[PDB]
Design a protein around this ligand. Structure first.
Ligand SMILES: O[C@@H]1[C@@H](O)[C@H](O[C@@H]2CO[C@@H](O)[C@H](O)[C@H]2O)OC[C@H]1O
Ligand code: NI
Length: 376
């Protein structure tokens, strides 16, 4: 049974032989390298006394996926000061009140707050919502907007499900198949965006009128991942049609950056809501695929395993996600090896560090039993 039921989180690092003291130190150090004043590794920057943001170092912009990740990291680390700085920046510069996507958050902004687009990114919205629910549960709702956390979360999820009903807007989930979309105006998805474990919680905390829907979305996403992951390699494409096959119209039909999160998501869902034969086998497939491959040689791969000459742009992130996936197959043949590889991998430096480091901290929290569900 998952932690949702037992309220006990597996410390896989400890189960694999690492000492409690060294694990505590490593988690704290990872956080400090990302959120502290460590120039070469940091991804979080503070502005004034009430603002802050996470910088996509590779694209030199601020993204909702990153900001929502930051809020989730902050609430897991019990750092309301950082959570509020990020959420404040998000509401001030990213929330849209005009255009067809009013009610959603502009997905990319410049560091000064200027919006680079008026289009949103569903994976950002879903993380904002759960992070907000967790904030409400750990610290209680604030007296002034936008710090009335739980209300903000329910409001956002209302839009995600009902936008378009009486307006030109579009929902972020297809109402018929209950699957999250890549973006509001298209009819295809992105495997890495599927968070059934998040939807399970939304079915308990979202507006009551949508709780049944969220339970159905959780089930739909679990079934979707089964048809999206290659049967032999376990690799999932970045973008995929609702039928599960890759959408490579613009080059996103292979195993690359977005895809890495699938293994991590499967690992967290297993830890929170229980393991499954499919999940264990899926993680075993992915880890088996990388068992004989060196990180320095990781490439972009077709989901069937065929390698491209192009190297992985975020190999550290790949390592982190594969290790986090071990939570779904603790007795897997490569589970220990993956966790050890991750432990032996330093936080990334350089201009492409942002994505790797976000995945790195999530894996550090999950593998140490610190990526928890915060109940009311
Ligand atoms: O085309 C845009 C997408 O690229 C964008 O998706 C983001 C890309 O970076 C990923 O790391 C994020 O997870 C994802 O949100 O969404 C908006 C869309 O217009
Ligand atoms: Ni030490």
């Amino acid at each position: 049974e998952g932690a949702f039921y037992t309220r006990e989180y597996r410390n896989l690092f400890k189960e694999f032989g690492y000492s409690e003291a060294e694990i505590q130190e490593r988690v704290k150090d990872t956080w400090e390298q990302l959120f502290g004043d460590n120039p070469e590794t940091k991804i979080y920057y503070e502005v004034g006394d009430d603002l802050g943001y996470l910088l996509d170092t590779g694209n030199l912009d601020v993204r909702t996926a990153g900001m929502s990740y930051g809020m989730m990291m902050a609430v897991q680390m019990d750092r309301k000061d950082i959570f509020d700085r990020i959420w404040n920046w998000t509401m001030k510069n990213m929330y849209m009140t005009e255009g067809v996507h009013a009610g959603y958050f502009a997905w990319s902004c410049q560091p000064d707050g200027t919006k680079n687009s008026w289009g949103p990114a569903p994976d950002g919205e879903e993380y904002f919502a759960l992070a907000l629910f967790f904030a409400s549960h750990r610290w209680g709702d604030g007296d002034e907007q936008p710090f009335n956390y739980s209300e903000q979360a329910r409001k956002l999820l209302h839009t995600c499900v009902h936008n378009g009903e009486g307006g030109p807007g579009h929902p972020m989930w297809n109402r018929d198949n209950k699957l999250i979309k890549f973006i509001p105006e298209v009819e295809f998805s992105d495997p890495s965006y599927h968070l059934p474990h998040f939807y399970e919680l939304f079915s308990l905390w979202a507006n009551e009128e949508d709780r049944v829907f969220w339970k159905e979305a959780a089930e739909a996403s679990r079934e979707y991942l089964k048809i999206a992951c290659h049967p032999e390699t376990g690799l999932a494409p970045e973008y995929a049609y609702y039928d599960g096959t890759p959408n490579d119209e613009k080059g996103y039909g292979h195993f690359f950056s977005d895809s890495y999160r699938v293994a991590a998501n499967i690992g967290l869902d297993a830890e929170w809501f229980g393991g499954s034969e499919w999940s264990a086998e899926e993680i075993n497939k992915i880890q088996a695929f990388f068992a004989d491959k060196e990180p320095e040689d990781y490439r972009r791969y077709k989901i069937d395993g065929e390698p491209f000459e192009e190297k992985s742009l975020h190999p550290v992130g790949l390592i982190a996600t594969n290790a986090m996936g071990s939570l779904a197959s603790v007795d897997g043949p490569y589970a220990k090896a993956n966790v050890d590889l991750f432990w032996n991998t330093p936080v990334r430096t350089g201009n492409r560090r942002y994505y790797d480091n976000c995945l790195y901290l999530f894996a550090m929290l999950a593998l140490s039993g610190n990526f928890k569900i915060w109940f009311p």
